Amino acid sequence: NDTAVGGEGSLPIPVSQPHIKMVSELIRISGKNLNEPQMNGSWHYNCNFTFKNTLNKEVTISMAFPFPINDGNSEIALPAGQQTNVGQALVYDFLVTVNDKQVSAQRGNIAPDQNKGLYYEDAYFWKTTFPPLATVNIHHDYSTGATYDVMGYHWVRYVLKTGALWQDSSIGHTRLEVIPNTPTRLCSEIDQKADYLNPTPSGMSISGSRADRKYIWDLRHFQPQADLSLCLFTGISYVRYKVIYPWLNSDDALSKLARLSNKELRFLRNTIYAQYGRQFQSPDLQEYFSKKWWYVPNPDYSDRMLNEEDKKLLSMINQAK
């Protein structure tokens, strides 16, 4: 199991082909516990949508929120305080309001439309009545787990291609905001090799610093040709998969560790502890980790935070030299 699947967000979609256009969206995706080694991270989605009836008559349509489920084939990335099992949605506490009034959402089946980017068979359904030429406000509030994989990546996703099911090409004014609430880097800023790691859609800007580093899109007349695909590195996951695990998985680990310069071996050893926010008194180390994006000093640091992988690497360093 390469990926621990946590769930993702999706645009609302119509059951049929109505004369309803999506004129604006405000999608806020906020992270919680993403740097916890227990992998109990979550994403909280607050989504607003503006729809316009383009017909000068009253229309009643059924809207659906599609979602992935636990099909028992994969490892699941669970949010803290949530339980899962086969057949359950990878969406938690889904709440939908129609014109700011909370409505009953009924779970049911939906046929996929892979040509329009719909790959799910399960959805939450609700009715929406539009008076002649009227606008209807749709609001979503739900959570998912935080998808992660064997490469150390964190994935935050949102299906936007399905916007093609609504009238006209564009989904109008699209505002998207990803807020991890922990220090991050794009995997395309560290693993500069692959393009599937580049954030989609086009037009992303980076705002803020440290735990407040946000990823923002602000698109007008947006023709949804790509989904939201954002691959991130969190602090502990970067140090584990890009620094600790390559040495542990190495074929000539003791020979390769002996090949390191005295500075490289000193920084490698201390990175094992810097991972948990150990405070450094030595100027060379103090200055080195001050300049590392993943390093955050933790006043509650303890050597008890070192896991079996950390201890195996320290044991290898002891044997290499």
The answer to whether the Cα torsion of 258, 261, 263, 267 is positive or negative is: negative
The Cα 36–Cα 33 span in angstroms is 5
- The closest of 294, 288, 192, 308 to 243, measured between CA atoms, is 294
Closest CA to 318 of 274, 257, 237, 252: 257
Nearest to 40 by CA among 72, 69, 76: 76
Tell the residue number behind the tokens 């609430």, with chain if given: 181
Residue 68 preceded by cis peptide, ω within 30: no
Structure obtained using: X-ray
Question: What stretch of H or E contains 248?
Answer: helix 245-249
- Alpha-carbon distance of 264 to 124, in angstroms, equals 53
User: For residue 42, what are its two tokens?
Assistant: 């979550």
Other Cβ atoms within 10 Å of 48 Cβ, number: 16
Question: All domains of the chain, ordered by start, with CATH?
Answer: 1-234 (2.60.40.3680), 235-321 (1.20.58.1690)
Task: Spell 210-233 as b/e; 16+ CB within 10 A means b.
Answer: eeebbbebebeebebeebbbbbbb
